[PDB]
């Protein structure tokens, strides 16, 4: 499996109820390891996975110092964005930042990214070459110009190609018994009527890690896409995931329908049916 | 590890 380290940042201006809300979370793959929350009583970057806890006080202090400096950057940002888009102070607004890096099977670098959003939409994003920017609109061109002139791309690339990958690999090694586990799906199927001559076959996958899965449905060998309902993958709350796929099916024909399950924790792919 | 460089205001 390929691996990834990402950070997600959310700033929300609350006009007249004081300073902005700031929440920062970090992930290795589908496992969250750190949070910072500006309303939480600690004002510290906190652990959220047991393998990060073995990092010393120097790690925590430095991560707090860094994350507060993110929060201060976003606190200014909200007011500048206001001016760019000619908005008054009285309205609440959001900025989101996401950055991080990918490695492959051998843990060599794959890709790095830094994307930035204002009020839901794309604002500015760093391209895959890591040396250039995509501005979404005319306001974001003033950022793009500023960020070129300060050589922000150069500083960020040193992190994404460098520090991000080293620390990714370190976390991978220190939490090997959790991050490099695969949990296979436990699978079953349910059958439910919707009329006297129609039935729903629902194909289920539970207790699996990582979140990448692919439920498909076939009829007599060939796949059926368009009576298919696929729900969004959801957390079970214990670090594992859940998903289902459904099909509206004419009654007495459940036998010709097979559910196919692919996941990285399965040697051969699974096949469930009803006949 | 968060970045400690390469973040700037818009």
């Amino acid at each position, epitope marked *: 499996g390929s691996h990834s380290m990402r950070y997600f940042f959310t700033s929300v201006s609350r006009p007249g109820r004081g300073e902005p809300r700031f929440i920062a979370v970090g992930y290795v793959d589908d496992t969250q390891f750190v949070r910072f929350d500006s309303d939480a009583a600690s004002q510290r970057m906190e652990p959220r996975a047991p393998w990060i806890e073995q990092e010393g006080p120097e790690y925590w202090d430095g991560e707090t110092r860094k994350v507060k400096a993110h929060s201060q950057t976003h606190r*200014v940002d909200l007011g500048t964005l206001r001016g760019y888009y000619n908005q008054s102070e009285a309205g609440s607004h959001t900025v989101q930042r996401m950055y991080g890096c990918d490695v492959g099977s051998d843990w060599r670098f794959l890709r790095g990214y830094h994307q930035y959003a204002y009020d839901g939409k794309d604002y500015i994003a760093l391209k895959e070459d890591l040396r250039s920017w995509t501005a979404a609109d005319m306001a974001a061109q003033t950022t793009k110009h500023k960020w070129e002139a300060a050589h922000v791309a150069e500083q960020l690339r040193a992190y994404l190609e460098g520090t991000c990958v080293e620390w990714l690999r370190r976390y991978l090694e220190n939490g090997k018994e959790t991050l490099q586990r695969t949990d296979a799906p436990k699978t079953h199927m349910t059958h439910h009527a919707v009329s006297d001559h129609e039935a729903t076959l629902r194909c289920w996958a539970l207790s699996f890690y990582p979140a990448e899965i692919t439920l498909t449905w076939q009829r007599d060998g060939e796949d059926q896409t368009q009576d298919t309902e696929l729900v969004e993958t959801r957390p079970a709350g214990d670090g594992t995931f859940q998903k289902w796929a459904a099909v509206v099916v004419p009654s007495g024909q459940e036998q010709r329908y097979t559910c196919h399950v692919q996941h990285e924790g399965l040697p051969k792919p699974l096949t469930l049916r009803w006949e | 590890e968060l970045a400690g460089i390469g973040i700037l205001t818009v």
Partner: T-cell receptor
Amino acid sequence: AGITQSPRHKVTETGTPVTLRCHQTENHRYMYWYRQDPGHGLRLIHYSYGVKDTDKGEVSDGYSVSRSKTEDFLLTLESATSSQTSVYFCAISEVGVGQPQHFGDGTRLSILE
Amino acid sequence: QLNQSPQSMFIQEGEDVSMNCTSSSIFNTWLWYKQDPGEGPVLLIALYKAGELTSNGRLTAQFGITRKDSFLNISASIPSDVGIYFCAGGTGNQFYFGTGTSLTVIP
């Protein structure tokens, strides 16, 4: 014309209030007042993230500070003591993470009994 | 308060100058400054990863893999290189400075 300090030189007696003023054009940024001493190097007195928002450095005692506009960062010494004879420097950082600090030209202050 | 060695060096003109800093905390940027008598410190080099960021001119600087280390080399020195030299280490939002090395150039 970057950063300006005023005054560049002041010779005054003990007990006198002294304000050092630091001005920058560029716009929204972090501002810092440091002092330079023969053995100690640059020690930080006070800093500022923005307007009305200041915090202490390693040697803040006998000093105050004020940020009414983004352009101005006033270092004030309410009753000058002789130990505050020094060379004082204003510095400037862009808002972000890990940005380099650019320095003013210095203010040399003599406080005499 | 950062460990800068040497404190003072007297060097003959045309030769090379070396100075270094040591820390106990990890930093993510290393900066090097020059100060002339009467003026402020002026930023010479800003470093962002390990390996050697080469120059404004005859000045080369390095930044340790362990991130607790940096050094400055000035080659083929010149009489106008006299002054005090400072390293700086950045922790996110603030900077810690070395004690300085005073360079003077024998002509």
